[PDB]
């Protein structure tokens, strides 16, 4: 290290150094304490390679609660072999690592490798936190909302009622009848200290995996349902239902039924009822 080049502290001027000057002049008992600054300081990858090597010498096993906050543009470099032996327990550190992981505008559609080493960090955290917190899911669905319907039936059921609130119906697009049956009650048990219009607003997202016994009970609240929220419904919850029941649900949203006649929960329920019964709907429907 030359006379006048000994790093007095972290500054702009360090960028006009080289790879070999950094290892001889920079202190390791400094780089830890003051780290937040280096995120604003544009170093070359070659200079960051040396900085990554300088902290390897100080913290060899993992990296404390302290270090991972200002990790920034190194999360990308870090490979699963060392990530395994990490610790977090802070909602803050999370967002930072996920913001920079959102530095992939290469393939806006799944490029045949959507999630590599982030996969690990997540499973690494959920074990650390214990369960899946209300707070926790909010910040996850903010980077990956579709991850909810990209779990296995198991991990879905280890999920308490007070962590359904953080769901809006944007998450439950690519969900099949199996995964919705798991989530359904958890909602009905979460939103049980409630009633009326305040009740329905939230419940609408899941109603695809619900039973006849609670289609009856909905009608007697004079509630309104759309047509898009009828194509969801399970085949076998629909067929016990009378004319007046359907008309006390879809009600105003019914007119455009004619168009969606040859589709899932309709094409059969039409035939099931009487000809006369359908003609009182005055929507031009056949079979009886």
């Amino acid at each position: 290290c030359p006379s006048g080049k000994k790093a007095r502290e972290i500054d702009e001027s360090l960028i006009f150094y080289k790879k070999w000057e950094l290892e001889a002049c920079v202190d390791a008992a400094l780089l830890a304490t003051q780290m937040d600054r280096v995120n604003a300081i544009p170093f070359t990858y070659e200079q960051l390679d040396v900085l990554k090597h300088k902290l390897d010498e100080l913290y060899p096993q993992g990296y404390p609660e302290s270090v991972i906050q200002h990790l920034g543009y190194l999360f990308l470099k870090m490979s699963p072999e060392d990530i395994r032996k990490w610790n977090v327990t802070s909602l803050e550190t999370l967002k930072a690592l996920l913001e920079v992981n959102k530095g992939h505008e290469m393939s806006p559609q799944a490029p045949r490798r959507p999630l590599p080493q982030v996969a690990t960090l997540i499973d690494r955290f959920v074990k650390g936190r214990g369960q899946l917190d209300k707070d926790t899911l909010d910040t996850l669905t903010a980077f990956y909302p579709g991850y909810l319907c990209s779990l296995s039936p198991e991990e879905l059921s280890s999920v308490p009622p007070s962590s359904i609130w953080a769901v809006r119906p944007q998450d439950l697009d690519t969900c099949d009848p199996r995964q919705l049956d798991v989530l359904y009650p958890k909602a009905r048990l979460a939103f049980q200290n409630m009633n009326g219009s305040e009740y329905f607003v939230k419940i609408q997202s899941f109603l695809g995996g619900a039973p006849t016994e609670d289609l009856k009970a909905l009608s007697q609240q004079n509630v309104s349902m759309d047509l898009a929220t009828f194509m969801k419904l399970r085949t076998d919850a629909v067929l016990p239902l009378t004319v007046a029941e359907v008309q006390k649900l879809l009600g105003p949203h019914v007119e455009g039924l004619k168009a969606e006649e040859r589709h899932r929960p309709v094409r059969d329920w039409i035939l099931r009822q009487r000809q006369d019964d359908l003609d009182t709907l005055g929507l031009g429907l056949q079979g009886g």
Epitope: S224, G251, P252, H253, V254, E255, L257, D279, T280, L281, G282, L283, G284
Partner: antibody, heavy 119, light 107 residues
Framework: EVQLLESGGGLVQPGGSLRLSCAAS????????MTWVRQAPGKGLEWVSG????????YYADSVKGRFTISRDNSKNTLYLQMNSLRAEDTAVYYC????????????WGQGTLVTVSS | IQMTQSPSSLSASVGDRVTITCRSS??????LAWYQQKPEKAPQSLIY???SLQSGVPSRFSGSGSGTDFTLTISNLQPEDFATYYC?????????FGGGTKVEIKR
Amino acid sequence: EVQLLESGGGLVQPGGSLRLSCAASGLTFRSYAMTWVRQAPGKGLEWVSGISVSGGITYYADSVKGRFTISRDNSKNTLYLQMNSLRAEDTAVYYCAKRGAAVGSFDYWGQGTLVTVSS
Amino acid sequence: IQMTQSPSSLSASVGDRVTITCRSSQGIGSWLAWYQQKPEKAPQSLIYAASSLQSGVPSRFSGSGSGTDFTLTISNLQPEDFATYYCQQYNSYPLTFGGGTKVEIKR
């Protein structure tokens, strides 16, 4: 394709009787319901009556409950409005409409017939 | 049962977003309609229920609200969209219509 020609609209002296027709072309008639809407000439819109698919179940607006009398048929294919004890308020253009759903919108209408009343 | 349209008459430029409003007294879920009228010629139908486009209507149109305070929009007017637009309700008998909004050009 889906037509509805109103006919029978003339002038009538006050208090006089008069009947209207709307002969449909394009739809299976038996399996939809109908209505009668009148435009206050120039400025406004207003509804008159509605009949069900059965036609035992009739609805009316209060400025004509018992004066005006709806009626329908399948074989001759004709919606009938009997407007009795007329006055100059009634003087309007009547539009015959096909209810797109059972208590839904009015989706299709007729080119429209005028009725005049005056001494 | 009241039904109020706003404004009296509106005037805007081709390619500007047109904002028409429809209020009521008593709540009417989504039993509300939207109809276009050409001078001394048949009325045409648009939105049949709150946010539901009638068969053969350009998607530039947009029907919104719920309960009492509603809205009809037109993103980028076109030249054949100048008309007397009408807001109607059908929840209860009788059916009710609005004061109609006469939407004109600007020179």
